[PDB]
Paper text:
The human assembly factor Coa6 participates in the biogenesis of the CuA site in complex IV (cytochrome c oxidase, COX). Coa6 is a soluble IMS protein with a CX9C–CX10C sequence motif, which binds Cu(I) with a KD(CuI) of ∼10−17 M. Coa6 deletion in both yeast and human cells results in diminished COX assembly and activity; however, this defect can be partially rescued by exogenous copper supplementation and in yeast by treatment with elesclomol (via a proposed elesclomol–copper complex). Here, we present the crystal structures of human Coa6 and the pathogenic W59CCoa6-mutant protein. These structures show that Coa6 has a 3-helical bundle structure, with the first 2 helices tethered by disulfide bonds, one of which likely provides the copper-binding site.
The structure shows two monomers of WTCoa6 per asymmetric unit, arranged as an antiparallel dimer. Each monomer is composed of a 3-helical bundle, with a coiled–coil–helix–coiled–coil–helix (CHCH) fold. The sequence of WTCoa6 includes four Cys residues (at positions 58, 68, 79, and 90) in a CX9C–CX10C sequence motif, which in the crystal structure form two intramolecular disulfide bonds per monomer, between Cys58–Cys90 and Cys68–Cys79, in accordance with the fully oxidized state of the protein. The Coa6 dimer has buried surface areas of 701 and 656 Å2 (for molecules A and B, respectively), which are 15 and 13%, of the total surface areas of each corresponding monomer, indicating that WTCoa6 forms a stable dimer in solution. Interestingly, an analysis of the geometries and potential energies of the Cys58–Cys90 and Cys68–Cys79 disulfides revealed that the Cys58–Cys90 bond has a +/−RHHook geometry, which is commonly observed for disulfide bonds within thioredoxin-like proteins,beeing classified as a “catalytic” conformation. In addition, the structure of WTCoa6 shows that the Cys58–Cys90 site is proximate to positively charged residues (Lys53 and Arg55) and bordered by aromatic side chains (Trp59 and Trp94), which partially shield the site from the solvent.
Residue numbers in the entry:
A (entry chain B): 50 to 119
B (entry chain A): 52 to 111
């Protein structure tokens, strides 16, 4: 994709993630920004970003559990 | 701390099984059982998501 298209893809991924972060992962609340993300990014990049998101979220859950024993 | 070393070792042995069998997890079911038995559930989910990510990142 062009430099512009890459920036629009990365910004649409940032807005979608920012949606999921702020709204405590309710993803049926970010269907508009998910559409924008899917329309803006190469299919391979959407797959890469979704897998990276899952990794980072579960890593955060893992490190949280270690820092705050109950 | 022992339990923690055991879980990391189990995750290493399972992952090395996946590497040697080109990611056919069905070839590594006994090591998968050992991994699940040695690690907290929260950790297994983290490691599984790391593995899914790193294997996909390899195509690039």
């Amino acid at each position: 994709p062009s430099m512009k298209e890459r920036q629009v893809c990365w910004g649409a991924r940032d807005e979608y993630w920012k949606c999921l972060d702020e709204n405590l992962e309710d993803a049926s609340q970010c269907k508009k920004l998910r559409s924008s993300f899917e329309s803006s990014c190469p299919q391979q990049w959407i797959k890469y970003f979704d897998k990276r998101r899952d990794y980072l979220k579960f890593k955060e859950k893992f490190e949280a559990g270690q820092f705050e024993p109950s």
